[PDB]
Amino acid sequence: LSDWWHQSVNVVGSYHTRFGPQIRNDTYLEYEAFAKKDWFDFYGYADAPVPLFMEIEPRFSIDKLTNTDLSFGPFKEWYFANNYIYDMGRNKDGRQSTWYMGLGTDIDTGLPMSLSMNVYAKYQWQNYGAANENEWDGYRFKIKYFVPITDLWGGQLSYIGFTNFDWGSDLGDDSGNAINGIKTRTNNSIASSHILALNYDHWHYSVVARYWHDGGQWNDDAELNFGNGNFNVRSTGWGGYLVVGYNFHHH
Numbered sequence: 001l002s003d004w005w006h007q008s009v010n011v012v013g014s015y016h017t018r019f020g021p022q023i024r025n026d027t028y029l030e031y032e033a034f035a036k037k038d039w040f041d042f043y044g045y046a047d048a049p050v051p052l053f054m055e056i057e058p059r060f061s062i063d064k065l066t067n068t069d070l071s072f073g074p075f076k077e078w079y080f081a082n083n084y085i086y087d088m089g090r091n092k093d094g095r096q097s098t099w100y101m102g103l104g105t106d107i108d109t110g111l112p113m114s115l116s117m118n119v120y121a122k123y124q125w126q127n128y129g130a131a132n133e134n135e136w137d138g139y140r141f142k143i144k145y146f147v148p149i150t151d152l153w154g155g156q157l158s159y160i161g162f163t164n165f166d167w168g169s170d171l172g173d174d175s176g177n178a179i180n181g182i183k184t185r186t187n188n189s190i191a192s193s194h195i196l197a198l199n200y201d202h203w204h205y206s207v208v209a210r211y212w213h214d215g216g217q218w219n220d221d222a223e224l225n226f227g228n229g230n231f232n233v234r235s236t237g238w239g240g241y242l243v244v245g246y247n248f249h250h251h
C-alpha cells in the first residue's frame with residue numbers, strides 16, 4: 001500500500017564499479033522498495049541486465065515486538081537488523097548468498113536528518129567459489145543517513161549516505177598470493193556511498209559517488225592473470241552511478 005510500501009523501477013548506468021577483480025561499467029533495470037510500519041522497516045533492491053542481483057535490508061523493532069521502550073540516550077529504537085545479498089550468477093558456481101544479522105538502531109541527532117547504525121555477524125553460503133563459503137565469516141558495521149536539502153527545479157533535492165565497513169573475514173588469509181607477491185584477497189573492506197537525489201511526484205534522478213577500499217575484499221593492486229595477460233586489481237578508488245526511475249502510488 002502506498003501509505004507505507006514504496007516501489008520504484010529505475011534504469012541505472014554505472015562507471016568504474018569495484019566489487020569484483022576487474023573494473024566494470026554496466027547499465028541495468030532495477031526494482032526498489034522501502035517500507036516502515038511500526039514494528040518493521042525495510043529497504044531492498046533487485047538489479048537485472050540491460051541475470052539477477054538483489055540486496056535486502058529488513059529490520060525488526062526489538063522495542064515494538066518486546067513492547068518495552070528500550071529507548072536510551074540518542075538511541076530512539078533498537079532492531080534485529082539484516083543485510084542479505086544474493087547474486088544469481090551465470091553458474092550456480094559464480095553466485096553469492098550473504099547473510100548479515102545483528103543489532104541495529106536509530107540515532108536522534110537533534111539535527112534535520114536521519115541517522116542509523118547497525119553491526120552484524122555473517123554467515124557465508126555461496127561466494128563465487130571463494131575460500132570462505134559456507135561458514136560464519138566476518139562482521140559488518142553499516143552506517144546510513146538521510147538529509148533533506150531543499151527544493152530544486154520543482155522537485156525535492158536530498159542527500160543520502162551510507163557506508164559498509166567489513167572486517168574480521170578470514171578470506172585473504174585463506175586465499176593465495178598474486179603474481180604480484182601481495183595476497184590476492186582481503187580480510188576486510190569498505191564501500192562508502194554518497195547520493196544526491198532529486199524527487200518529483202513520481203520521477204526521480206540520482207547521482208551516486210561510491211568509494212571502495214579493497215572492493216569485494218579484493219586486495220588492491222593484486223597482480224592476476226585470467227588468461228589474457230597480467231593485470232592489476234583496482235579495488236580501491238571511486239566509481240559512480242546515474243539513476244533515473246519512477247515511484248508508483250495511487251493518488
Ligand SMILES: O=c1ccn([C@@H]2O[C@H](CO)[C@@H](O)[C@H]2O)c(=O)[nH]1
Nearest residue numbers: 019020046047048053054055085
Ligand atoms: O554488496 C554489493 C552491493 C552491490 N553490488 C553491485 O552494485 C549494484 C548496485 O548496487 C548491484 O546490482 C551489484 O552488482 C555488489 O556487487 N555487491
